Design a protein around this ligand. Structure first.
Ligand SMILES: C=C1/C(=C\C=C2/CCC[C@]3(C)[C@@H]([C@H](C)CCCC(C)(C)O)CC[C@@H]23)C[C@@H](O)C[C@@H]1O
Ligand SMILES: [Mg+2]
Ligand SMILES: [Mg+2]
Lengths: 238, 10
């Protein structure tokens, strides 16, 4: 019951995600080295890397490049951390509640991310998010529709053409529902779709809390060389 | 402005 166009869309997004996500984690050797705000330079380098991948991903979702430049920028700045948190589930493992990226030297757990200045009000819900998304056990297509739907939120600050944005989300979400209804015939379709948008709501709270702590981290690391230009454009600059 | 972000979008 999945239309040919919904099947093509899912296919496009899976192609986009594979091109902009690198499960060999081979550029990690290039970031500044981890140290165990001692982990800020490495973790900052990582998010600045990752944001660029998110931008690569965006540009390949149909109808995003067709947006005006200011809309794209306001969409990226609203959801950039939320999409990094989603896509990071790929490297997350419940075997020790870490993000592990090719080797144990690039293995991040809740403690390493407090040596980058963050606090329990974000980290604890962060790892609970990671564990619970794992238990969702999403198919590759559900994963990538979620990252796209989280980007095409017409309610973000600064969005000028909200009608166009809602149309793309409409399309995105109709396709998600259809997939759930086909692929999971034994579950309540309403129940499955709700458990996924619920994650989108918890991504907004993770994002507000991250925003809050970043303000003070960046102010703290203002004279040091710790934050790279891209994070400053995305998250703020004091 | 947002120099780098602007250049990524091309
Ligand atoms: C990114 C990706 C990865 C990990 C993400 C993690 C684990 C380390 C801590 C991170 C980076 C969180 C930090 C609390 C964010 C802090 C950002 C800053 C220090 C600038 O305020 C955000 C998501 C978490 C690895 C790989 O999956 C690519 C993915 O894309
Ligand atoms: Mg990647
Ligand atoms: Mg089923």
């Amino acid at each position: 019951q999945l239309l040919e166009e919904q099947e093509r869309l899912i296919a496009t997004l899976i192609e986009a995600h594979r091109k902009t996500y690198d499960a060999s984690y081979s550029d990690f050797s290039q970031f500044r080295p981890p140290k165990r705000l001692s982990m800020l330079p490495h973790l900052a380098d990582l998010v600045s890397y990752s944001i660029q991948k998110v931008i690569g991903f965006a540009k390949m979702i149909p109808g995003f490049k067709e947006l005006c430049t200011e809309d794209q920028i306001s969409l990226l700045k609203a959801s950039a951390i939320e999409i990094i948190i989603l896509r990071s589930n790929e490297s997350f493992t419940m075997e020790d509640n870490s993000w592990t990226c090719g080797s144990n030297e690039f293995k991040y757990q809740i403690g390493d991310v407090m040596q980058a200045g963050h606090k329990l009000e974000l980290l604890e819900p962060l790892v609970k998010f990671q564990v619970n998304m794992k238990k969702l056990d999403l198919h590759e297509a559900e994963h990538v529709l979620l990252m796209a739907i989280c980007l095409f939120s017409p309610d973000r600050p600064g969005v000028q053409d909200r009608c166009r944005v809602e149309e793309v989300q409409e399309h995105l979400t109709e396709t998600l529902r259809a997939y759930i209804a086909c692929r999971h015939p034994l579950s309540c379709k309403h129940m499955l779709y709700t458990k996924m948008v619920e994650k989108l709501t918890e991504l907004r709270s993770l994002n507000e809390e991250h925003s809050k702590q970043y303000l003070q981290i960046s102010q703290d690391a203002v004279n040091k060389e710790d934050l790279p230009p891209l994070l400053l454009e995305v998250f703020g600059n004091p | 402005r947002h120099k780098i972000l602007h250049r990524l979008l091309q």
